[PDB]
Ligand binder design. Structure first.
Ligand code: GDP
Lengths: 69, 420
């Protein structure tokens, strides 16, 4: 009975340790998923901003007609 | 902080210098009264900024010129050293009789500028070479300041006369008389010529009626972009000497070429992007440099390129390596990695990327060649000689100057020959 009381100790401790480590790994996976959104969004913002700026530049250039004094 | 003195001789040099000071003011946002809106400017009591420059000519008319255009109100009257006659296109006047009568005062005020300064790095000169005032008085000042300030380096943006653009007919004499004296007391004689500027402004930007204004604008742009990697931070900084070591392996092979990018017109700017591949594909061409010496007719002993804006050093350096491993025929082999870059984190007003390119090539000898050529067909007949022999000038000057021209061109020729 004592050796069973102790083997269940070992078993419970190990089947808790492993679940804890797997939880840590899942948390790291979530952290990387989160980090991905930064490079997903900053690039979108910079793309839209380049679009706006270069469109405004095209406009300002094209807005040169004739003077006719 | 590595201050710079700014000499402007002759009418051409003075107009170009006015253009350059107004471009600089456009860069650091200094309205034409000298208020905000120390490498170039000096503080005057009241927070005013007076450009640390000095102007000179023998015809006070040019005075009024620099008082006409905007940003003319900046320069200080305590540096306006001027004559009365005007060198009248002759090199004798502005070097032996009348020039030497004003070199004293101009050197005095230059000493007043320099001795007050503590961190002085290098000089800079803007002057024609056929015009008597510019060529003569400027080369005399160069001789003086370089026998007095030996260590520091020089910069003479000499605007050489090209023959296809005819202005006067005494250009070769003054040209050679200047170039013989430039090769000793000046370490960086970066040449420009109105032929290349006319060609560029015609067939690169479709300008309708180009006048000297926009040409001086382009030269001022190049001159600013040269040292823009000094007054502003950058991921890989450079200065005058970092240029002046990677570009000149000898005490005589110190004659350069200039270039600037990018340039396009309204009806054409909707089609080109702005990345270092495109700027590189534009800057190394022939119609994108400001010297009438076809670069593909030789090689480059060396070349540096100062970028302005913010890019990823990898793209710049890979583009350099690629263009060096592609046009290897137009490059020289006995010096490895014969190109150099310098990234600077400040673009010009209104752009994102800009390139100022300098190149020591073995193809500009041709230029000097043709000038010396004219000399022959104007010296064997001894034409227009008495205007020189009347002011102590003797015949040894012309013959030894042509000798030195031949020596220089043979140097560049044998280095085009020199391989390994
Ligand atoms: N690109 C350009 N060339 C100029 C300018 N002004 C003069 N040049 C040339 O300079 C040459 C004459 O030099 P100049 O200074 O007038 O004679 P000097 O006063 O005796 O030295 C001529 O070939 C002019 O065409 C300018 O503003 N821009």
């Amino acid at each position: 009975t004592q050796t069973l009381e102790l083997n269940r100790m070992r078993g419970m401790l190990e089947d808790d340790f492993n679940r804890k480590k797997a939880s840590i790994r899942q948390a790291v996976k979530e952290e990387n998923q989160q980090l991905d959104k930064q490079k997903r969004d900053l690039e979108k913002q910079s793309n839209n901003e380049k679009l706006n700026y270069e469109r405004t530049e095209i406009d300002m250039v094209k807005t040169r007609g004739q003077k006719r004094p | 902080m590595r201050e710079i003195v700014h000499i402007q001789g002759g009418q051409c040099g003075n107009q170009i210098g006015a253009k350059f000071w107004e471009v600089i003011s456009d860069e650091h946002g200094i309205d034409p009264t000298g208020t905000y809106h120390n490498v170039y400017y000096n503080e005057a009591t009241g927070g005013r900024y007076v450009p640390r420059a000095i102007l000179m000519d023998l015809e006070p008319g040019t005075m009024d010129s620099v008082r006409a255009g905007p940003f003319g109100q900046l320069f200080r009257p305590d540096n306006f050293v001027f004559g009365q006659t005007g060198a009248g296109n002759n090199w004798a006047k502005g070097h032996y009789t009348e020039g030497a009568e004003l070199i004293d005062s101009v050197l005095d005020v230059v000493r007043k500028e320099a001795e007050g300064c503590d961190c002085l790095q290098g000089f800079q000169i803007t002057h024609s070479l056929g015009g008597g005032t510019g060529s003569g008085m400027g080369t005399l000042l160069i001789s003086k300041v370089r026998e007095e300030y030996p260590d520091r380096i020089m910069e003479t943006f000499s605007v050489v006369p090209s023959p296809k653009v005819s202005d006067t007919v005494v250009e070769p004499y003054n040209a050679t008389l200047s170039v013989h004296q430039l090769v000793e007391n000046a370490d960086e004689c970066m040449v420009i010529d109105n032929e290349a500027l006319y060609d560029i402004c015609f067939r690169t930007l479709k300008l309708t009626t180009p006048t000297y204004g926009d040409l001086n604008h382009l030269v001022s742009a190049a001159m600013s972009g040269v040292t823009c990697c000094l007054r502003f931070p950058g991921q890989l900084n450079s200065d005058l000497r970092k240029l002046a070591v990677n570009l000149i392996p000898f005490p005589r092979l110190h004659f350069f070429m200039i270039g600037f990018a990018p340039l396009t017109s309204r009806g054409s700017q909707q089609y080109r992007a702005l990345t270092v591949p495109e700027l590189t594909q534009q800057m190394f061409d022939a119609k994108n440099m400001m010297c009438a010496a076809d670069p593909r007719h030789g090689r480059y002993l060396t070349a540096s390129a100062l970028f302005r804006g913010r890019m990823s050093t990898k793209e710049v350096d890979e583009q350099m390596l690629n263009v060096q491993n592609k046009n290897s025929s137009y490059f020289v082999e006995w010096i490895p990695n014969n190109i150099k870059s310098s990234i600077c984190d400040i673009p010009p007003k209104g752009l994102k990327m800009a390139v100022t390119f300098v190149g020591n090539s073995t193809a500009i000898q041709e230029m000097f060649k043709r000038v010396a050529e004219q000399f022959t067909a104007m010296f064997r007949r001894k034409a227009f000689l008495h205007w020189y022999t009347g002011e102590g000038m003797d015949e040894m000057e012309f013959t030894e100057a042509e000798s030195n021209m031949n020596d220089l061109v043979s140097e560049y020729q044998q280095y085009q020959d020199a391989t390994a």
